[PDB]
Amino acid sequence: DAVTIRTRKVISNPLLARRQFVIDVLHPNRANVSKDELREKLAEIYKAEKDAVSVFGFRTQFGGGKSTGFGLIYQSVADAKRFEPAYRLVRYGLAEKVEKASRQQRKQKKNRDKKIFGTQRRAQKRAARRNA
Amino acid sequence: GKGKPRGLNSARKLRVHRRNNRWADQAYKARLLGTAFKSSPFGGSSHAKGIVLEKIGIESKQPNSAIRKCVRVQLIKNGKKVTAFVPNDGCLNFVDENDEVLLAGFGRRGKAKGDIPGVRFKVVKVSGVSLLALWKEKKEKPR
Amino acid sequence: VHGSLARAGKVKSQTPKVEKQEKPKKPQGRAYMRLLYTRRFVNVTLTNGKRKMNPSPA
Amino acid sequence: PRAPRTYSKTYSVPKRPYESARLDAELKLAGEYGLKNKREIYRIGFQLSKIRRAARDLLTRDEKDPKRLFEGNALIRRLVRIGVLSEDKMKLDYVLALKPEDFLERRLQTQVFKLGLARSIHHARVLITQRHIAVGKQIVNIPSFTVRLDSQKHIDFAHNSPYGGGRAGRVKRKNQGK
RNA sequence: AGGAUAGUGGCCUACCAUGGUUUCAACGGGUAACGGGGAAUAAGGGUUCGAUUCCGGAGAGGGAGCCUGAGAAACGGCUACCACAUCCAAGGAAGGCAGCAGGCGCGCAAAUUACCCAAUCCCGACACGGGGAGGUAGUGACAAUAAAUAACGAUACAGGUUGUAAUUGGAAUGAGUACAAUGUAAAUACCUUAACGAGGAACAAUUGGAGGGCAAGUCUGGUGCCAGCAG
Ligand SMILES: CN[C@@H]1[C@@H](O)[C@@H](O[C@@H]2[C@@H](O)[C@H](O[C@H]3O[C@H]([C@@H](C)O)[C@@H](O)[C@H](O)[C@H]3N)[C@@H](N)C[C@H]2N)OC[C@]1(C)O
């Protein structure tokens, strides 16, 4: 309860269609403050929408209380989708996880494909008439 | 006077003279001949391993009278045979013929120690376990 | 009056075994330094320059 | 690979391990200031030796030498801001008279039992370790934390400790059940 | 003078001259020699170390020869021989971990056949793809920093105003565990933290010593120049 938020070292970034700042949080008698709650409170303070708010890298001070981090307010939501890495959007629920096998499986697959000159159809038919 | 040249252009004579006479110092001569690499039983290593060939008792030198328990050891790296003291009361019964021992120096960098003549090494481990552990019953002899 | 390899471990093997006596633990760290300081420089036992740290009970 | 990170040793053991007079001196210092081992005396000896060396090297120079005027005054500033020197000994000559107790007096533990927050210096160290002490509004659990002259008046208890406005520890919360 | 080279040059060829280096150490031999930036010690002068986070060189089992290409005498390119080593239907075919991990060997002597391109940065036709380069974790007492293993009362004591004693209580807490959030590419850990988490606070500190050098017993039992200790 009674979570105070402050910003310092503010940079406006038209180049990335956003605004950059460092977040300072005062939360007595509470472990820390969730990133989604911080995002909503920031959206409320700056009357912006939540899906255009970014928070990352939060570090509680020694003993407790004061925490710090970084904040990004994109001037829209399409700009958020366009200048935001996939993992942060996955954290926010905005984007889905790209589906793929383990890295070793992908590499083994790639090294099997280098064995074939042409298409898979020709190799499959040649193997078929090669066996039976 | 002083028997050494003092001329300001005599650096060659001074440096060569020092180089010649440094051969009279044992440590310099040993490290430039490479005697540890060529003639030391351990080949310059701090420790070495070997197979026990036999148990031997060595008479302590005067004015002491005792039997210092030692083992004759054949080293693995070079096949050399050395004698190592097995230090503590009853620790000879822990080592047996054909066992593998770890040897270390005996404290005086290639010299014998105390009243034990001709012994320059000591047993540290037998069968992969230290003698200090076995003597104190902190471990067990493997089998 | 000779020794032999057969006599190895004589005195230790024939030493009468005595178990440790159960005693309280000794404080560790700063408490031990406190204790030694109190022994030597607080509760003094000096008498005309006789300050044995380990006198024999007698 | 990444560049190597520097690291150094902060103490040095004595050259003679068994001089009885200095052994008694170290035991007295540890007992007076509630230290844990002899290495804590060795560290302050290390710091004092290097400070005196720096002062001596600067004092080989003339009062008009610019290197003295810069480095000696920086050294004086650091010493007078941590509490080792007062506002009347800024000449590098009083830098040579500093003793281990001068730094021992400026520790967190010493000042905690001096102010009155604890009875014995051992109890002071024990409070510091259990995070009951805050410098400013920052909890400090380091007894070798050296307080500066403009930090002495802000030492007090932590707001979350049972000694400065907090709740009860597990012992009292179990012992209040009945 | 020519040839060759990207180009100079005995670099090579033809003709010609007889020169070139050396006790101010040539030439030869050894190096358990890659060089330097640097490291330890350090009154000064010195002595010793530097395979190894950066810079330069060299190599890819050993030699040699090449294609391609701006650039290689390239080896995760080719050709041959030597040595190793693989499959086979016996005709033939396929190789190069001094890259990461892992195995055998060797030895006194050194970690996982893990996760990932999020960061540093490089490559490509490229804002998108790839990267054991790199980063993350596992192992890890190499070395280094900080820093627990207890703190405070009252009774009976006692001392000469508290320096000293057992048995009498209440607190304090982090090691550990675990919601949670945070941390992260996802984790793990740290840090914050709900509920737990101390009387033998058994949640119990060890390693070496106690004749001298050198700090700390002539206390007790055992052995009797034996067993053992002892730089
Ligand atoms: C076999 N042991 C040799 C021992 O004989 C001696 O060697 C000297 C050697 O030092 C002398 O050589 C020395 O002195 C000459 C000086 C005369 O000009 C110097 O020029 C030379 O550099 C120097 N090494 C050499 N001329 C004779 C050997 N016997 O000292 C070196 C040594 C290795 O110990």
Q: Across the beta sheet with D138-139, what order do the strands follow?
A: D138-139, D133-135, D155-157
Conformational region of residue A118, where left means phi above 0, alpha means psi within -120 to 50, and beta covers everything else: left
* Helix (H) or strand (E) segment spanning residue D48: helix D39-59
Which residue has its alpha carbon closest to ligand 1 atom 15? B16
CA atoms within 13 A on the CB side of B66: 12
Residues from chain C contacting residue D129 (CB–CB below 8 Å):
none
Q: Which two tokens stand for residue A74?
A: 């994109």
Nearest 10 degrees: CA dihedral of B3, B6, B12, B17? 20
For residue C54, say whether its CB is under 7 Å from any atom of strand E: yes
Breaks in chain D after residues (C–N exceeding 2.5 Å):
none
Q: Which two tokens stand for residue A10?
A: 């503010």
CA atoms within 13 A on the CB side of D28: 9
Q: Which two tokens stand for residue D60?
A: 């080989």
By CB atoms closer than 10 A (0-12, 13-18, 19+), residue B68 is: buried
Written in H, E and C, the secondary structure of D100-126 is HHHHHCCEHHHHHHHHCCCCCHHHHHH
Q: Which two tokens stand for residue D42?
A: 């060795």
* Buried b or exposed e, range A17-36, using 16+ CB within 10 angstroms: ebbbbebebebeeeebbebe
Cα C6 to Cα B65, B67, B100, distances in angstroms: 16, 10, 22
The C-alpha atoms of residue D109 and residue D127 are separated, in whole angstroms, by: 9
By CB atoms closer than 10 A (0-12, 13-18, 19+), residue D110 is: buried
Tell me the torsion sign for CA atoms B81, B87, B90, B93.
Answer: negative
C13/B90 touch (CB, cutoff 8 Å), yes or no: yes
Q: Is D9 annotated as a binding residue?
A: no
Max intra-chain CA distance, chain A: 77
Strand partners, A19: A12, A73
The C-alpha atoms of residue D43 and residue D10 are separated, in whole angstroms, by: 6
Q: Report whether A22 contacts A54 (CB < 8 A).
A: no
Residue type, C48: N
Q: Dihedrals φ, ψ of D125, to 5°?
A: -60, -40
How close are the terminal C-alpha atoms of chain B, in Å?
74
What lies within 8 Å, CB to CB, of A84 at 6+ separation is A54, A74, A94
Task: Kindly report the nearest CA distance between residue A32 and chain D, in angstroms.
Answer: 15
**Which of A111, A110, A107, A84 has the alpha carbon at shortest distance from A95?**
A84
Q: Which two tokens stand for residue B141?
A: 């002899």
For residue B119, say whether its CB is under 7 Å from any atom of strand E: no
Is the omega angle on the peptide bond into residue B63 within 30 degrees of 0, that is, cis? Answer: yes
Q: Across the beta sheet with A18-26, what order do the strands follow?
A: A4-13, A18-26, A67-74, A53-60
Q: Report whether D130 contacts D160 (CB < 8 A).
A: no
How many CB atoms within 10 Å of residue B76?
A: 12
What lies within 8 Å, CB to CB, of A35 at 6+ separation is A55, A56, A58, A91
CA of C29 to C1' of E159 (A): 29
Pocket test for ligand 1, best of B17, B20, B32 (most atoms within 8 A of CB): B20
For residue D132, say whether its CB is under 7 Å from any atom of strand E: yes
CA of A46 to C1' of E60 (A): 62
Q: Report whether D100 contacts D110 (CB < 8 A).
A: no
CA atoms within 13 A on the CB side of B93: 12
* Helix (H) or strand (E) segment spanning residue A9: strand A4-13
Q: Report whether D138 contacts A62 (CB < 8 A).
A: yes
Strand partners, B100: B51
